[PDB]
Enzyme design. Sequence first.
Site, PDB file in Angstrom:
ATOM      1  N   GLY A  17       0.843  -1.181   0.000  1.00  0.00           N
ATOM      2  CA  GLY A  17       0.000   0.000   0.000  1.00  0.00           C
ATOM      3  C   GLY A  17       0.878   1.231   0.000  1.00  0.00           C
ATOM      4  N   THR A  21       5.235  -2.155   2.030  1.00  0.00           N
ATOM      5  CA  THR A  21       4.904  -3.563   1.812  1.00  0.00           C
ATOM      6  C   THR A  21       4.630  -4.355   3.102  1.00  0.00           C
ATOM      7  OG1 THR A  21       7.208  -4.392   1.686  1.00  0.00           O
ATOM      8  CG2 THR A  21       6.195  -3.588  -0.390  1.00  0.00           C
ATOM      9  N   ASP A 128     -12.369   3.651  10.712  1.00  0.00           N
ATOM     10  CA  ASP A 128     -12.173   3.048   9.407  1.00  0.00           C
ATOM     11  C   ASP A 128     -12.680   1.647   9.383  1.00  0.00           C
ATOM     12  OD1 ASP A 128     -11.455   2.929   6.751  1.00  0.00           O
ATOM     13  OD2 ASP A 128      -9.332   2.578   7.127  1.00  0.00           O
TER      14      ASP A 128
END
Length: 263
Positions: A17, A21, A128
């Site tokens: 992302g 890694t 989130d």
Amino acid sequence: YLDRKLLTLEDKELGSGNFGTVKKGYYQMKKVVKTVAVKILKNDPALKDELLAEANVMQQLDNPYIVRMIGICEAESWMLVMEMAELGPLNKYLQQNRHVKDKNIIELVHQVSMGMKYLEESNFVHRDLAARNVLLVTQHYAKISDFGLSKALRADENYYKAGKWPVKWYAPECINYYKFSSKSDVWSFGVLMWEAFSYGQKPYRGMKGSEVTAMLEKGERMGCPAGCPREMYDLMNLCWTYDVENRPGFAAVELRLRNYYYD
Ligand SMILES: O=S1(=O)NCc2ccc(Nc3nccc(N(CCO)c4cccc5[nH]ncc45)n3)cc21
């Protein structure tokens, strides 16, 4: 802080992302060797702060349905080392496994609700909560992950006043007033349920954030996924109660899921 010598990493990479890694590894606890997932920072003050805020939060959390942190290791890079949830993100799994039964999905979402009830009691907001941020240990054991946006609420406050803006999972008070509470996490949990019963399909497909906000204020909501029990769709709708005051907390959500599951 962890001993780099006691950590062994695979050469393979599980994912990557913005932060960098992810690698699978092993960490020697006193006697037993434990399988781990590791965020390895690529090459950035924000990313370090991101990893730092997540570690700061995890360190204080202790629950069967929340991913456990092993620790941090400073070596060739900064490493955040978590216990491995072998089957990975709930959305991708259900996307590859449509045979999963409604009762199996109900079990996993109840598990999330139990982790969030704990989070709520602990006065932390996740901010989130989404199917991509639930990891599977086994097909019958889910854990909440990805605490990068999470916040410990102050002793005198019920909400956090506010980067990454996953608007399709956000309650109206979040979008309109920047207020994040456990009740906002409840809204997100409703979206999460929808995802789970849609076998990892993205919510509000084809819609821009502003379009979702307009839809919700009109009083419209996403429909029942194919084969989703009605009682579970009704619980999604309760989670998506517009007025935060009248939206249920995780205690009531968890209760409701438990009774449906065990009956
Ligand atoms: O999405 S993936 O990278 N690609 C396939 C796959 C398979 C298994 C996992 N499992 C996993 N278990 C625990 C923590 C963890 N990660 C990496 C993913 O964010 C973490 C490491 C450090 C901090 C963390 N917070 N939340 C998750 C996480 N991953 C993950 C994946």
